[PDB]
Design an enzyme around this catalytic site. Structure first.
Site, PDB file in Angstrom:
ATOM      1  N   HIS A   1     -17.904 -15.358  -7.600  1.00 12.10           N
ATOM      2  CA  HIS A   1     -17.240 -15.552  -6.551  1.00 12.10           C
ATOM      3  C   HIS A   1     -18.384 -17.074  -5.670  1.00 12.10           C
ATOM      4  CE1 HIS A   1     -20.329 -12.635  -5.094  1.00 12.10           C
ATOM      5  NE2 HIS A   1     -20.294 -13.608  -4.340  1.00 12.10           N
TER       6      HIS A   1
ATOM      7  N   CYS B   1     -26.850 -12.950  -3.691  1.00  8.08           N
ATOM      8  CA  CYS B   1     -25.249 -12.705  -4.818  1.00  8.08           C
ATOM      9  C   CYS B   1     -26.584 -13.459  -6.191  1.00  8.08           C
ATOM     10  CB  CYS B   1     -24.835 -12.748  -4.775  1.00  8.08           C
ATOM     11  SG  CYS B   1     -23.610 -11.564  -3.527  1.00  8.08           S
TER      12      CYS B   1
ATOM     13  N   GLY C   1     -26.407 -14.613   0.734  1.00  2.00           N
ATOM     14  CA  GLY C   1     -27.006 -15.384  -0.280  1.00  2.00           C
ATOM     15  C   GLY C   1     -28.139 -14.630  -1.414  1.00  2.00           C
TER      16      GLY C   1
END
Ligand SMILES: [Cl-]
Ligand SMILES: [Cl-]
Lengths: 306, 306
Positions: free
Chosen positions: A41, A145, A143
């Site tokens: 993603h 991830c 942020g």
């Protein structure tokens, strides 16, 4: 003496953390040998997350659209592919700080350390457990991830988790390093609800053993029980059922302390039925279930890592 | 979302850890530039610890009696001196992994990360606070002496603690990196008792703010208070007195959440007087006091380190 929620030393993983930017999305990646692993993603905008078709969104992406920054140096991307819910970005330079490592898919109730990162830079380290409902209770902001969870055995890092999503209820979901989510979650902004967060019974018992090893013993009683009778109490309080496999794993701690596993089950029973009456165990006012029996043995004996 | 007891990334300190052996005693040292810092009781036998005369015991020690091992490579000792309760061992090679660093003496209520080590090898990392009685509640076994506590600001490691002793009650005592003990403790096996372990009031309030930021709000009430009236309750429960300095430090969190500091003091008051009625706050059944206001801001905003 003393027992603490302790993470593995993070230096070996710190040296693997990089920043990955695609378009206007920036998150963290994991640089091992000449491959960089990150959540797929990264290619999505905030609007895409509602109903993304990742294969279709990826068609518009070329190697040069993935900007990979190792601290201050830019890495050259020479290839990319999608594996389940992760992207593998092939770079032209092997990470010189790559440790010995493995990819492992852990089971519910297993613990691991998380290195929280933003923009490829380490922020902090803490200990987590894979809950029985396949979430983790972490500390993740926008942020983060691409942050990973790991265990270390001497010189080898076993990577087990990569952070992907935050459920509306505040808990967290992610994948192993092959891109497969733990549990039924998906990388879409969707009505996703976690199941019952049961307590990891075997970990609570291990932690009770740790307490006895360190002088906290007020909870030891004169009773014993059987697996079937204890499990009738466990179910009532949403505790995982205790199996003979769990008893065997606790054997070494039972041997060291001289308290049979079933005697300690009877102490846990009374703690669940009567509460703790305002007392504490190893500085906690509830029963901790994020220490495995292997965690207890390690911390109580001074095991180190290369 | 989520709030966790989080340590600083340990890699920068891991690269400074070495093993120091004198005679038959082995503990950890800290290798910065061309100096290795370790507790001075490395020169002691178990019998010496009862009534050691460190100056007299040191006369029998020469450079070659201090064996310094950086992982697998032996370091050459070219000089040694005693500074308060630490030894400084001058080696002929500057540590190539030396980070930017400072030596700081922290105040009670300040937090820091500990890298537990045995035989110069990192074992794990956890977060601590200097208690008001100048102890710390750590996790230290025989051989962990020389382990250090530290904070990181971007690229600079501030070393604040070196572990030396374990009190009979299971708590821990140590020095700053200049060799001066925190509190009244000494490096002798002696009747040493810790004073009252008061609760760090300002840290509990910061943690209540952290809880509100993350959705835990059941404890917010309709009341307010004054410093003097709240401190009458704080004293009764062995809480540190709250000062106007503490209120000012909480200002930024008060600004972000819109809850005046004194309104949150009134919520804390009711929690102390009525207990938590079996509820939880950020996964805890007691009031946590080992998060500073700066810790809360950091974790709730995603601050990183070089
Ligand atoms: Cl653990
Ligand atoms: Cl903290």
């Amino acid at each position: 003496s003393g027992f603490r929620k302790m993470a593995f030393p993070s230096g070996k993983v710190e040296g693997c953390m990089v920043q990955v930017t695609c378009g206007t999305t920036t998150l963290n990646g994991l640089w091992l040998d000449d491959v960089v692993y990150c959540p797929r993603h990264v290619i999505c905008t905030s609007e895409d997350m509602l109903n993304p078709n990742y294969e279709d969104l990826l068609i518009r992406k070329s190697n040069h659209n993935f900007l990979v920054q190792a601290g201050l140096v830019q890495l050259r991307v020479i290839g990319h592919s999608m594996q389940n819910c992760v992207l593998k970005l092939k770079v032209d330079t092997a990470n010189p700080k790559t440790p010995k490592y493995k990819f492992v898919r852990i089971q519910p109730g297993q613990t691991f350390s998380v290195l929280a990162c933003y923009n490829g830079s380490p922020s902090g380290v803490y200990q987590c457990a894979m809950r029985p409902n396949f979430t983790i209770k972490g500390s993740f902001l926008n942020g983060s991830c691409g942050s990973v969870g790991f265990n270390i055995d001497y010189d080898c890092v076993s990577f087990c988790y990569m952070h992907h999503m935050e459920l509306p209820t505040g808990v967290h979901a992610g994948t192993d390093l092959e891109g497969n989510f733990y549990g039924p979650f998906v990388d879409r902004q969707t009505a996703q609800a976690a199941g019952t967060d049961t307590t990891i019974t075997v970990n609570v018992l291990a932690w009770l053993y740790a307490a006895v090893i360190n002088g906290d013993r007020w909870f030891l009683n004169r009773f014993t029980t059987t697996l079937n009778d204890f499990n009738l109490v466990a179910m009532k309080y949403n505790y995982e059922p205790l199996t003979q496999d769990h008893v065997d794993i606790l054997g070494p701690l039972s041997a060291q302390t001289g308290i049979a596993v079933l005697d300690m089950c009877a102490s846990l029973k009374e703690l669940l039925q009567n509460g703790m009456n305002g007392r504490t165990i190893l500085g906690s006012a509830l029963l901790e279930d994020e220490f495995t029996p292997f965690d207890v043995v390690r911390q109580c004996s001074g095991v180190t890592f290369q």
